[PDB]
Design a protein around this ligand. Sequence first.
Ligand SMILES: O=c1[nH]c(=O)n([C@H]2CCCO2)cc1F
Ligand SMILES: O=c1[nH]c(=O)n([C@H]2CCCO2)cc1F
Lengths: 306, 306
Amino acid sequence: SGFRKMAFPSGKVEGCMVQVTCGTTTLNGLWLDDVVYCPRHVICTSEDMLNPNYEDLLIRKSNHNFLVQAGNVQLRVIGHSMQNCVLKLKVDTANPKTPKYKFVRIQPGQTFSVLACYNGSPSGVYQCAMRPNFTIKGSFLNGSCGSVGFNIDYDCVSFCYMHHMELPTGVHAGTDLEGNFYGPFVDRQTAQAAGTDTTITVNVLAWLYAAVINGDRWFLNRFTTTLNDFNLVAMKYNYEPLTQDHVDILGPLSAQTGIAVLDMCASLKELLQNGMNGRTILGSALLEDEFTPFDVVRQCSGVTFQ
Amino acid sequence: SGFRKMAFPSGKVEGCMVQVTCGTTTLNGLWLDDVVYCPRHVICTSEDMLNPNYEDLLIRKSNHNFLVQAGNVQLRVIGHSMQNCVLKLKVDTANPKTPKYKFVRIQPGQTFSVLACYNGSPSGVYQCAMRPNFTIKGSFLNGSCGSVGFNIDYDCVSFCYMHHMELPTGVHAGTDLEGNFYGPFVDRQTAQAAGTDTTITVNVLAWLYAAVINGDRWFLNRFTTTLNDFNLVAMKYNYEPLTQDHVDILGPLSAQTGIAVLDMCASLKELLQNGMNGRTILGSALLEDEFTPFDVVRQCSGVTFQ
Ligand SMILES: O=c1[nH]c(=O)n([C@H]2CCCO2)cc1F
Ligand SMILES: O=c1[nH]c(=O)n([C@H]2CCCO2)cc1F
């Protein structure tokens, strides 16, 4: 019945996006209860970003210097503090659209939806993964900082990402909602290079299961393998090593399809060694690694959010 | 700065989704003002779908047979009528979350976002295109009928698609919001085959412009071509013929990049004739055709919706 790169419905998060301006700089904030979260680099000018001393720059800012606007209405800022790389602006009004929510720090390999925003206004929604090198491959222009990534379980939004930086190579870095960067990145305009962009093996396997469920089966073969043998191949192709935990996580998709995990690993092994020979899998000409096992079960089972 | 398959924010549409049950069949409806729109096959049993006489089946239905539920609240049905392949259920309460909206019948080659829903509850959002054969390549399970596709211009939702049918080949067919199918498809479980899935040439060119803007430039070459020469190649590869209207639509992306449209056509020609030689463009190993010129400008310029 089809398999698409699918984001979570964005309405619960749209209702939390605001605009934050400090001096000359405008970016997005996230309004939950009576706190607005935004990147701490809102206080910087373009020149400040080369070598910013955030504590010193913040001394010169007062509550009334943070202009916070939710659509056309202005919010009153009654306190401010810095937590790691985020600012928390306490406002005098709780967001009436605050969904049930949690702050989660995700693991590399996990996926989430991004609501790209500008001037506090949502522009679009797309699905991302936290890469093993702790970058994300997003779509962010100037003004998009403070846009967030999130997952939804039924009625609860788990926020996991806030956007802060574009590296010189065009990939993206940011923090969790406690303001701690993913990976080694810092909010300074400096030479920061990403490490190896390794492929998320367990996700590729999940997507191959999704393909079989939908009738793209040409890559199934007569072979099997072992974890250690497979991983010799994973290593050569800059794939994450597959572990027994990963095998266990794939158990449900294995049970539903009747294809043993290690047999699917043998299919992936052949695909890595031989390529796809000009064929496609679920409309892709490369091996997709930004669907988790949970994403596949969810999309193949129609789980909804209330 | 990155280029992603991006859907519109879904919140305005989430607020319109309801559940409609008639007898044993449950699917989704769209609640705008005091009307709920849903597929007319809600009145059918599984057996009825082989040879349904909708007018005869509807004679046996009254207002109280259509159970309409918006979240946990029940809506009172005060009238019903069939328009083409949709039912319009008049309810006694206008949807307080009705956004500004229009009904549009899109052209093949145009893109839109789908809010996949089950039992009236949103599951996910993704971007689709109306294919030249009038199918869409979606992700729809049993229960997803009545999910809608839409575009947003600033504050106005233009609804263009309602989901009705999965063909035996796994692609999807549906109607506009006046209930007229796209293409030749009918709401009957019969032998319906899609025609040739031609590639949307103007969209491929737009995406190549997007690639250049983002620094994927390896496919630029020293050549040019003409519309007629290019189209000889398009035809061989089952690409839509490129017209002067398409060239004109690409004008802005041509102006911004300084790459003449026909020079980009020569790049595409070489890509069609030689393939990508194991390289990628914007993270894809095939030529992507579900971004329109407007989608590229929008995403590259950060247009937002209020
Ligand atoms: O840190 C937190 N504080 C909160 O008050 N909530 C409540 C507020 C609404 C739903 O959850 C959640 C958190 F994660
Ligand atoms: O057919 C239509 N009828 C309407 O009342 N509207 C109004 C109602 C809210 C915004 O638009 C739009 C239509 F497209």
